[PDB]
Write a protein that binds this DNA or RNA. Structure first.
Ligand SMILES: [Mg+2]
Ligand SMILES: [Mg+2]
Ligand SMILES: [Mg+2]
Ligand SMILES: [Mg+2]
Ligand SMILES: [Mg+2]
Ligand SMILES: [Mg+2]
Ligand SMILES: [Mg+2]
Ligand SMILES: [Mg+2]
Ligand SMILES: [Mg+2]
Ligand SMILES: [Mg+2]
Ligand SMILES: [Mg+2]
Ligand SMILES: [Mg+2]
Ligand SMILES: [Mg+2]
Ligand SMILES: [Mg+2]
Ligand SMILES: [Mg+2]
Ligand SMILES: [Mg+2]
Ligand SMILES: [Mg+2]
Ligand SMILES: [Mg+2]
Ligand SMILES: [Mg+2]
Ligand SMILES: [Mg+2]
Ligand SMILES: [Mg+2]
Ligand SMILES: [Mg+2]
Ligand SMILES: [Mg+2]
Ligand SMILES: [Mg+2]
Ligand SMILES: [Mg+2]
Ligand SMILES: [Mg+2]
Ligand SMILES: [Mg+2]
Ligand SMILES: [Mg+2]
Ligand SMILES: [Mg+2]
Ligand SMILES: [Mg+2]
Ligand SMILES: [Mg+2]
Ligand SMILES: [Mg+2]
Ligand SMILES: [Mg+2]
Ligand SMILES: [Mg+2]
Ligand SMILES: [Mg+2]
Ligand SMILES: [Mg+2]
Ligand SMILES: [Mg+2]
Lengths: 165, 200, 47, 171, 115, 116, 48
RNA sequence: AGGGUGAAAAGAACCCCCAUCGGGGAGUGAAAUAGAACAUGAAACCGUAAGCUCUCAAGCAGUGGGAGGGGGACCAGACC
RNA sequence: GGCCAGUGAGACGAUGGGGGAUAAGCUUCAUCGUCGAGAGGGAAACAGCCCGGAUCACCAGCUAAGGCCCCUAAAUGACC
RNA sequence: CGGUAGGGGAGCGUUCCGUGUUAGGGAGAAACGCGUGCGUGAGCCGCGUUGGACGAAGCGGAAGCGAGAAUGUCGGCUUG
RNA sequence: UCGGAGAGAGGCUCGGUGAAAUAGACAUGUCUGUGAAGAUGCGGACUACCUGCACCUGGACAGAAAGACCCUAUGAAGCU
């Protein structure tokens, strides 16, 4: 601070920082509440979404679908970035009121989605070794991976209920 | 301990740090009759396409289950097999080998346990000290008079896992000679028995 | 005294798991009908 | 940074003794006040205290002279004993076999701080509650904000990393 | 022309050392041991990733088997799988095991649809 | 084990014990105050009280004993002259021990011993 | 005899701290001796 | 076997600790955190402080799972 | 055919015999298999036995030898 | 598209020379220490409160050229 | 036989000075099996809080000397 320049060894004091008045904490005024919201916000409502999930196949492995949520998947031939993609085969759809169970699949159901990115997986070291034989191999592998965003689920209402009583 | 403005301040910040940590954290949901997800955890990590590993708030040891097993004319080993299934948590959908998701078990009338064949005079419970002559053999019936409870304990211990957790799983078993137990406040229930060979 | 012990690799030939059962060896995988022709996994929309 | 105003560094260069033997004394005086150690070092059974007694006394003399501190408000914060250059020798033994011994050497580094340097700030900031403290610092400017937190209030209360989360004390 | 070893041995061993961050004792401090253990870690990693697939599967059988004995007496996992292929389902162990924990009411309906 | 053994060994054989304690009494009785270890001072109380006990019965037979014990000749003749007037009433406890810091060379617990 | 292998780094320290721990009990005796000597009431210890 | 202060000794007046050695300020210098046992100063080795953490264990010490807690100029369903 | 290597200590098992004592994880030949140079799964652990020959990734699925009370994955399944 | 002895093929990097009194460099080089970057990997590309004057890339060339072991070896430092 | 007591120097404690052989890293239990046939390190079971001091040495196929007995080399040397 300023007077610290004059002696760089003199003790600091409280009065040099601010005056000794401090007009009010104002603990009831909203100003005391506003500054709390400035440095200490709250959670607030989460992002709304549709209360639904579904199962879908990509490649040969399965995934659980939630709208407004993304997930990594195996690489897709073509499928450029920002491309509108539709996943056809779905194994079930679930809601609070009902749960549609794909027979092998749900007829005429579809999952609209978007391609976020087209990236490579984190490196995994394929290392091979045989002791007392001077055999050592160090090979990495960056797997091709895509990043899909889900938008919504449609084409499932004509399926029966199979609900719970 | 010490009530000073310095140390008292330190306790006030951590209450505030835990509070701020609690707000932006995701609330924990109990497993009993829950839907797939909520609006809160939907913004969280992918607990759906990854295996569900339990949190510490799941196996809260206070609110665990409690069972009873009347050993009056019950087969030893077959009764011990199911007790391991219930203590280890293998019957629950929330099974995890590295976590105590199971439950408690109480045994009563241990001295009335059934035993097949001539094992009452042939089965040899034994132990060793460390000397070259510290071997002490003991029959079922001789042990049945001295300590009836080691019979049940020695059988279930061989069925529980061996390691840190298995030594921790053993204390969940309570065994008693008489037809009564002091664990009334916990409100236990009768244990089911899928097998049909246990009742002579 | 005049009976060897069968200790080495012969211990494997004598003691390895075997079935020796026509009812267990004759078995095979279970047969189910084939599923219908399923649709593709993904399809592009104009974008 | 508070370390550049509170304490003083004082080193003992090339003190002919052993490292581990020194640490019997240095590990105990750590955290002891100035007057406390002088009563002890003059009465231990050890030989390592007379170099240290000259070193503890010399450091406090620098404080009142170069930074004007009161002797009664000193506390030994840090105290280290680092290895020095070891001289070597060769001693005969039986069968014409030679074994080497050595004269070790130390570099003792000692620090002396002052508690009565931030009592104007620290005793005030601790008097307030956490929530009441936010509105105080939230209304003032940055120059007044940086100065109240330049002391050891944050370290003693473990709030160094938490304040960044609330947009307070931004780098 | 003389050529010292230079720094190629140093920059090599730092990469070998940085991999050995959280190793205990001299397995994080001595070059002739870190090279001996860095070999072992990747072999164990390459071995676990192959065992990683059978392991989670092994866990899913228990969870699915554990979550279905409550429905019917004298009923079990093996009978549940035989009916799915009969009913021409396609769900794998991953989805069934997670629904058993996350939405248990669904399997109660799946059991009803089968019967 | 030393069960029932009351003797101060002082890490010396008998010929040196009989000379070491015998020599210190010569110095204490002339100086009145000396600086020695605590083990030597504890063993000294038995013998100093003996010589002082000889002075109370200041006969000729009792004097010859002190001459054989006390090395020098003048102190014994001077000892019997002053003790009956100085300790004409005391019955035992003719000396005290005051502790002291140890030495620099060997950390030996030191202590003074003096005649009351 | 001869040691088969070398002691580790932390097993060494645990044995050194015990040797250093004796200084903790020697410091208490000195502090007890000073406070029992700065009052000028003990007639059994001459310090000069 | 033992090489390297600095452009230039300007090799540190004076004050405190002080029997010396040695150290702390001052002053010199672009740099003294280049201060003479002094240039860049890796590793083993000896340490101080901080964050998590072990006293019913068992183990070529890691690896795949990852409870609870902690951390940061990018952001954060991430990363350490 | 050209250029140019290593190998020339073998091992157990099956079969066919010899030597030995129709003894040897013995020894010596002939025809095959595996290990040697071969991971993985089963066999409690266990180079030579059984299934099967690791280009790599996937928190996908069906199977082989072999198994389905618990430790420890799968029917404390059914019938004679 | 498992692979020891062993053979072939394709490449990385070190120091120095040619282009070269190169580009760049006290607006911080070499080095040292680092990294949510890239590569099949050897390594590359980048960063800096360290450092204080050197010196790439590219197209090519030459070697005192790549170390974890030789009861190796020099020096330094531990254990007991 | 049949040991016992005592003295002195060490041993033991405190202070000061302060080595050495040795040492792949070591978080270093027993039993019974297994295995290059004799395991703290693999399998199963049992036992076992952590860490020191003083004492005893069964094991670590302990340390010490590239076995000095035996054999091999178209090795060396002395002698007849
Ligand atoms: Mg036999
Ligand atoms: Mg089969
Ligand atoms: Mg070289
Ligand atoms: Mg598989
Ligand atoms: Mg002595
Ligand atoms: Mg004599
Ligand atoms: Mg420097
Ligand atoms: Mg230097
Ligand atoms: Mg226990
Ligand atoms: Mg514990
Ligand atoms: Mg041959
Ligand atoms: Mg024939
Ligand atoms: Mg043979
Ligand atoms: Mg042979
Ligand atoms: Mg082969
Ligand atoms: Mg076997
Ligand atoms: Mg199947
Ligand atoms: Mg069977
Ligand atoms: Mg099971
Ligand atoms: Mg190949
Ligand atoms: Mg192949
Ligand atoms: Mg260069
Ligand atoms: Mg320059
Ligand atoms: Mg060039
Ligand atoms: Mg004796
Ligand atoms: Mg003696
Ligand atoms: Mg000593
Ligand atoms: Mg241990
Ligand atoms: Mg065997
Ligand atoms: Mg054995
Ligand atoms: Mg192990
Ligand atoms: Mg073992
Ligand atoms: Mg001995
Ligand atoms: Mg030996
Ligand atoms: Mg030899
Ligand atoms: Mg020889
Ligand atoms: Mg020849």
């Amino acid at each position: 601070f300023e007077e610290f320049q004059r002696p760089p060894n003199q003790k600091p004091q409280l009065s040099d920082v601010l005056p000794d008045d401090f007009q009010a904490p104002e603990p009831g005024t909203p100003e005391y509440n506003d500054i709390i919201n400035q440095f200490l916000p709250k959670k607030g409502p989460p992002p709304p979404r549709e209360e639904i999930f579904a199962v879908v196949v990509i490649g040969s492995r399965q995934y659980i679908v939630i709208p407004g949520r993304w997930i990594y998947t195996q690489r897709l031939k073509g499928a450029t970035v920002n491309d509108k993609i539709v996943l056809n085969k779905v194994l079930l759809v679930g809601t609070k009121a009902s749960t549609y169970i794909g027979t092998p699949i749900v007829t005429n159901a579809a999952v609209h989605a978007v391609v976020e990115e087209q990236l490579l997986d984190d490196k995994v070291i394929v290392f091979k070794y045989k002791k007392k034989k001077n055999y050592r191999r160090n090979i990495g592998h960056r797997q091709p991976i895509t990043r899909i965003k889900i938008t919504g689920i449609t084409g499932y209402e004509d399926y029966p209920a199979s609900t719970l009583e | 301990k010490s009530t000073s403005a310095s140390t008292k301040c330190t306790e006030e910040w951590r209450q505030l740090k835990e509070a701020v940590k609690k707000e932006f954290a995701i609330p924990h949901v109990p497993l009993d009759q829950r839907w797939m997800f909520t609006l809160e955890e939907a913004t969280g990590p992918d607990i759906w396409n990854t295996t569900w590993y339990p949190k510490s708030a799941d196996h809260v040891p206070t609110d665990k289950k409690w069972y009873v097993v009347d050993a009056t004319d019950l087969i030893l080993g077959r009764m011990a097999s199911t007790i391991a299934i219930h203590i280890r948590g293998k019957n629950l959908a929330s099974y995890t080998p590295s976590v105590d998701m199971g439950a408690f078990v109480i045994v009563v009338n241990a001295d009335k346990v059934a035993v097949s064949g001539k094992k009452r005079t042939q089965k040899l419970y034994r132990r060793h000290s460390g000397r070259p002559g510290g071997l002490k053999e003991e029959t079922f019936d001789q042990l049945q008079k001295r300590i009836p409870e080691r019979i049940i304990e020695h059988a279930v211990r061989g069925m529980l896992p061996k390691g840190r957790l298995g030594r921790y799983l053993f204390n969940h078993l309570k065994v008693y000679k008489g037809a009564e137990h002091p664990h009334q406040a916990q409100q236990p229930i009768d244990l089911p028995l899928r097998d049909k060979r246990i009742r002579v | 005294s005049s009976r060897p012990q069968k200790k080495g690799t012969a211990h494997h030939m004598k003691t390895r798991p075997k079935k020796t059962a026509r009812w267990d060896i004759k078995r095979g995988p279970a047969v189910y009908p084939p599923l219908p022709p399923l649709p593709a996994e993904w399809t592009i929309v104009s974008s | 940074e508070p370390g550049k105003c509170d304490e003083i560094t004082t080193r003992g260069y090339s003190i002919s003794m052993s490292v581990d033997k020194a640490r019997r004394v240095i590990d105990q005086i750590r955290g002891r006040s100035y007057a406390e150690t002088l009563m002890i070092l003059e009465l231990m059974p050890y030989r390592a205290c007379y170099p240290i007694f000259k070193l503890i006394y010399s450091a406090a003399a620098n404080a009142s002279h170069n930074k004007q501190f009161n002797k009664a408000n000193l506390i030994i914060s840090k105290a280290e004993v680092n290895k020095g250059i070891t001289l070597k020798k060769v001693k005969p033994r039986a069968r014409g076999r030679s074994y080497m011994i050595k004269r070790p050497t130390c570099h003792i580094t000692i620090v002396l701080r002052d508690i009565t340097h931030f009592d104007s700030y620290d005793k005030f900031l601790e008097s307030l509650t956490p929530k009441k403290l936010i509105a105080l610092l939230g209304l003032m400017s940055t120059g007044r904000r940086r100065e109240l937190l330049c002391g050891r209030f944050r370290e003693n209360h473990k709030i160094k990393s938490f304040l960044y989360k609330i947009a307070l004390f931004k780098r | 022309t003389r050529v010292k070893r230079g720094y190629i041995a140093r920059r090599r061993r730092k990469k070998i050392r940085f991999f050995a961050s959280s190793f205990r004792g001299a397995h994080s401090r001595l070059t002739r041991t870190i090279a001996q253990q860095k070999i072992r870690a990747l072999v164990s990693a390459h071995r676990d990733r192959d065992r990683q697939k059978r392991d989670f599967r092994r866990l899913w059988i228990t969870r699915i088997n554990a979550a279905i004995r409550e429905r019917g007496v004298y009923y079990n996992y093996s009978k549940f799988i035989h009916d799915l292929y009969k009913r021409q389902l396609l769900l794998n162990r991953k989805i069934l095991a997670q629904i058993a924990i996350l939405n248990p009411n669904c399997i109660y309906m799946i059991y009803n649809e089968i019967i | 084990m030393k069960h029932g053994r009351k003797i101060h060994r002082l890490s010396r054989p008998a010929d040196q014990r009989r000379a070491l304690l015998r020599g210190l009494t010569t110095q204490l009785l002339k100086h009145g105050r000396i600086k020695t270890t605590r083990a030597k001072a504890s063993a000294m109380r038995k013998y100093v009280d003996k010589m002082i006990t000889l002075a109370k019965e200041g006969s000729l037979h009792k004097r010859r004993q002190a001459l054989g014990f006390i090395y020098e000749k003048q102190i014994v003749h001077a000892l019997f002259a002053e003790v009956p007037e100085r300790y004409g009433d005391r019955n035992g406890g003719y000396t005290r021990i005051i502790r002291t810091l140890p030495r620099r060379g060997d950390n030996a617990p030191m202590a003074y011993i003096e005649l009351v | 005899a001869v040691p088969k292998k070398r002691t580790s780094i932390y097993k060494k320290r645990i044995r050194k701290n015990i040797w250093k721990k004796k200084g903790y009990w020697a410091a208490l005796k000195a502090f007890s001796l000073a406070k029992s000597l700065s009052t000028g009431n003990s007639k059994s210890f001459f310090v000069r």
